[PDB]
RNA sequence: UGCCUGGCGGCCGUAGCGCGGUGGUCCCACCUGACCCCAUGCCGAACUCAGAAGUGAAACGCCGUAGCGCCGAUGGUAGUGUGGGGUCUCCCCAUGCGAGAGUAGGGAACUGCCAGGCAU
RNA sequence: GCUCAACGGAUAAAAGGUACUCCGGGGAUAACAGGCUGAUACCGCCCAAGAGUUCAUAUCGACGGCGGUGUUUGGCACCUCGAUGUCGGCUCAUCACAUCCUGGGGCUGAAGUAGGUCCCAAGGGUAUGGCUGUUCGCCAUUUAAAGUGGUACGCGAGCUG
RNA sequence: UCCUCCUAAAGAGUAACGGAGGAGCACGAAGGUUGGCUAAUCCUGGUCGGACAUCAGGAGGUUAGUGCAAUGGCAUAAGCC
RNA sequence: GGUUCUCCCCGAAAGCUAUUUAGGUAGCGCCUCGUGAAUUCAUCUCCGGGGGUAGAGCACUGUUUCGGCAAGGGGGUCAACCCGACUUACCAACCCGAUGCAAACUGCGAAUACCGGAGAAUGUUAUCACGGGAGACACACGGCGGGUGCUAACGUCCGUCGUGAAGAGGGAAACAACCCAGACCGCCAGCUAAGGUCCCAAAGUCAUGGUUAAGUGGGAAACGAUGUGGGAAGGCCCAGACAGCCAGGAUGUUGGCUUAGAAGCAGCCAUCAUUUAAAGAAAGCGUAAUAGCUCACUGGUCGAGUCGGCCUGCGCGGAAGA
């Protein structure tokens, strides 16, 4: 269903986040459970298209990171103050 | 034309921390000048008439937060 | 025009309106008009926009004015010199940051909301945009 | 050496409130009465000085409760010291420092002296 | 023993006018001008409750907003106080077009004559007298009009006062 | 003339005919020591007694108080006998 | 106001305090010379401490919106005189749940700024004390955080740095405060920074892919419109997408109306119901009003591309002064 092909964040920081947002992407975090949190980089348009659907914040989502499928839920989302953009998205591991 | 009120002011008393902690002081040296007891006297520290903390023995000035109310205390380490 | 009933002090400094907004999402109604630029909205402008949207929707729902004019702006009388105190209070404005929601509503359909906010936005200097409430 | 109790401290908001019911062989509290020697600007409401008839009823203390108060990551955001810029009442980039609040989570305190009463 | 409060306190002991004025200075500091900004001034534009027999645009337009000129009233004191004569009137004109007429058109709640508004267009023209020193204005009579501005609010080494 | 807050840019200091308020005192106790004590507000019951006193219990913990204007403090109490 | 021969070295200020003082003066801050002095001072790294300003928030002091708990009032719809059935484009204490604002609000809280302790490297002791001599207390601009003003001024008041004052050269046409860069002298020597390489005027009419048709470049806003590329996302699809055009487009029914004749072009309400092969008491409309047309809704031909909302760069009009 709601599948997201993510990657691994190489560098973290304000400049890295700005570059990711300028490169038609955005950072995100997967935390919860006992495993260490994982920083991921998502494409903007494909996630923006799924964000319109109301099921995105209600049903489970599948994230493929280097071939390892993980079931996560859209815990919280940060959006641009005055633009249809996604700043940062949290994912509870479940 | 016109007139305006509240043109008065007062001279600053030059309060604040003088030794800033971590310095070597002498007996009778004033550490902090303040209106209220923001910093309380600790070890080898006396309280003045105007709540001024003066060291009674040469040593090191140390800032710590002790007490049930998390109040700041000035301590003189006589090393 | 709306203004605070009383204040601790009559005059305030000019200040600077820099930063980002605080309330950037609709939490009361379903549709919202939010400022995209930067400026200072006045009580007269807010009242004019409220009247315009109310008469456009025929009060077929509810209206929320998120912002509130609370900053007193003073101007000196004409033909006077400089100094001699601060000028008397003239009006009241509300500092506006980009992304802040200005007006909120619900009940009305999407077409009616967008046709009412379209004419209510022309009464404000700051450019605005139309948004709909989402699930978080 | 392990049980709980008392006194003095460290640590003073994961160390504090609400709910459930236990503790007395010890220690504490409740309590008896009181001319003393002391006391109430009226009364043993408080200090006390003579004690153990009873009770753990209020306290005090102990065990669990996630209803609260709190501690609070990673990531993200706001801010900025330097240099370089734009459309300059404000913003962009290269750099380090990176908050507050809110999530995930943690949680029904640890600990040092003697002083006894307990099984050993 | 001093509200020496003008409070680091001239002496125990102190108010004004000068257009009859004079001296040394300042554009460090004003008034007329020039420069800078445009609150105010003029003009243009944006959305639309309506007026308009129904009908928002033929004409207007509340509640609000965004702009242009420097164009009145305003702010600064940047050139000038070892001198830049400012009001008004006569003669002499230029330039701008936000055009009074003439010229060419659109819409009209434009039947015709005659009107309202808007665009282009500066080639030319655009009063005479009473009142007060006038600018402004009132009135009387004509014209197509007796249009708005800048030119040190033009011009006194061109004239009066 | 002096003091309190902000402008005053997280040491000190820092201007305007800036925004806001006070001071030209009182006290032989309103000081020293010792001992003891802890409100503002609200709820319930009660003879006048009442939106209000003097009482008894409870909610709350400094939201009271500082001889004074403001700031900083005060429970060991700087608050009250 | 003026102050007359030369060279070398160093080299500021227009700030604080007081002043019948504000354009003067005195002390200090700043400068020069001489004598002494300590790893004295400065940069960088590590360590300790104070913050309470940005930012953030509403635990406190003020302000403010919508909800529930509520006492309920004010024109009642209805009686039309009623208790008022009841909510009447209204207001409404605490208590809770959210949403904002504050220089004189902080349960929290940075960077930088400042002090001290330790360490290498560098700097002509650049640091401090005293004595001789001054000068000076009219600063301006730009960057940064601000008061005041209109977040207007080549306006004014504060704090830091740079510049000029006290400074030549190159660049922006000229243009002290912008940028690069610090002029011992002489050179028919090379390199580079700001800034450019079509000619004035010196060096790419250089190379690789795109945008611009406005000369945008080479002034400006709200707003407005199939200019033009890009990015996704939509819906209509040979079960034939959209516009031609061939045609239909009805009755009870001149619908209660209101009258003007009203039958859609004066009206509140109606677009109820036969066939709906299809079929709006009809949106335009001449008009005293119909009596007429077209379109809405469809099927007759086609035959592959369409329909309108966002993130984007350039461009267009708003744009009129002597
Ligand atoms: Mg950065
Ligand atoms: Mg019990
Ligand atoms: Mg982080
Ligand atoms: Mg944090
Ligand atoms: Mg948190
Ligand atoms: Mg005397
Ligand atoms: Mg004097
Ligand atoms: Mg003279
Ligand atoms: Mg001068
Ligand atoms: Mg002048
Ligand atoms: Mg001049
Ligand atoms: Mg009408
Ligand atoms: Mg002329
Ligand atoms: Mg014209
Ligand atoms: Mg001519
Ligand atoms: Mg000709
Ligand atoms: Mg003229
Ligand atoms: Mg002349
Ligand atoms: Mg300070
Ligand atoms: Mg005591
Ligand atoms: Mg030199
Ligand atoms: Mg003088
Ligand atoms: Mg020397
Ligand atoms: Mg500072
Ligand atoms: Mg000397
Ligand atoms: Mg000297
Ligand atoms: Mg001075
Ligand atoms: Mg002077
Ligand atoms: Mg000078
Ligand atoms: Mg200065
Ligand atoms: Mg400066
Ligand atoms: Mg500034
Ligand atoms: Mg300026
Ligand atoms: Mg000046
Ligand atoms: Mg000079
Ligand atoms: Mg130069
Ligand atoms: Mg030069
Ligand atoms: Mg070369
Ligand atoms: Mg090169
Ligand atoms: Mg270069
Ligand atoms: Mg260059
Ligand atoms: Mg170039
Ligand atoms: Mg070239
Ligand atoms: Mg050449
Ligand atoms: Mg352009
Ligand atoms: Mg343009």
From Swiss-Prot, chain A:
GO terms for biological process: cytoplasmic translation; negative regulation of translation; response to radiation; ribosomal large subunit assembly; translation. It comes from the Bacteria. One of its GO terms (molecular function) is structural constituent of ribosome. It holds the Pfam family Ribosomal_L25p. Gene3D superfamilies: Ribosomal Protein L25, Chain P. InterPro entries: Rbsml_bL25/Gln-tRNA_synth_N (IPR020056), Ribosomal_bL25/Gln-tRNA_synth (IPR011035), Ribosomal_bL25_short (IPR020055), Ribosomal_L25_dom (IPR029751), Ribosomal_uL5_bac-type (IPR020930). Keywords: Ribonucleoprotein, Ribosomal protein, RNA-binding, rRNA-binding. The keyword Ribosomal protein applies. GO terms for cellular component: cytoplasm; cytosol; cytosolic large ribosomal subunit. Belongs to the bacterial ribosomal protein bL25 family. HAMAP family: Ribosomal_bL25. Part of the 50S ribosomal subunit; part of the 5S rRNA/L5/L18/L25 subcomplex. Contacts the 5S rRNA. This is one of the proteins that binds to the 5S RNA in the ribosome where it forms part of the central protuberance. Binds to the 5S rRNA independently of L5 and L18. Not required for binding of the 5S rRNA/L5/L18 subcomplex to 23S rRNA. This is Large ribosomal subunit protein bL25. It comes from Escherichia coli (strain K12).
Swiss-Prot record, chain B:
Residues 1-14 are annotated as: Disordered. GO terms for biological process: assembly of large subunit precursor of preribosome; cytoplasmic translation; cytosolic ribosome assembly; positive regulation of ribosome biogenesis; regulation of cell growth; ribosomal large subunit assembly. InterPro entries: Ribosomal_bL27, Ribosomal_bL27_CS. One of its GO terms (molecular function) is rRNA binding. GO terms for cellular component: cytoplasm; cytosolic large ribosomal subunit. Keywords: Ribonucleoprotein, Ribosomal protein, RNA-binding, rRNA-binding, tRNA-binding. Disulfide bonds: none annotated. Belongs to the bacterial ribosomal protein bL27 family. Part of the 50S ribosomal subunit. Cross-links to the 23S rRNA. Cross-links to the A and P site tRNAs. This is Large ribosomal subunit protein bL27. It comes from Escherichia coli (strain K12). The gene is rpmA.
Curated annotation (Swiss-Prot), chain C:
Pfam families: Ribosomal_L16. Is hydroxylated on Arg-81 by RoxA. The modification is nearly suppressed when E.coli is grown in anoxia. InterPro entries: Ribosomal_uL16, Ribosomal_uL16_bact-type, Ribosomal_uL16_CS, Ribosomal_uL16_dom, Ribosomal_uL16_sf. Transmembrane segments: none annotated. GO terms for molecular function: rRNA binding; structural constituent of ribosome; tRNA binding. The modification (3R)-3-hydroxyarginine is found at residue 81. Belongs to the universal ribosomal protein uL16 family. This is Large ribosomal subunit protein uL16. It comes from Escherichia coli (strain K12).
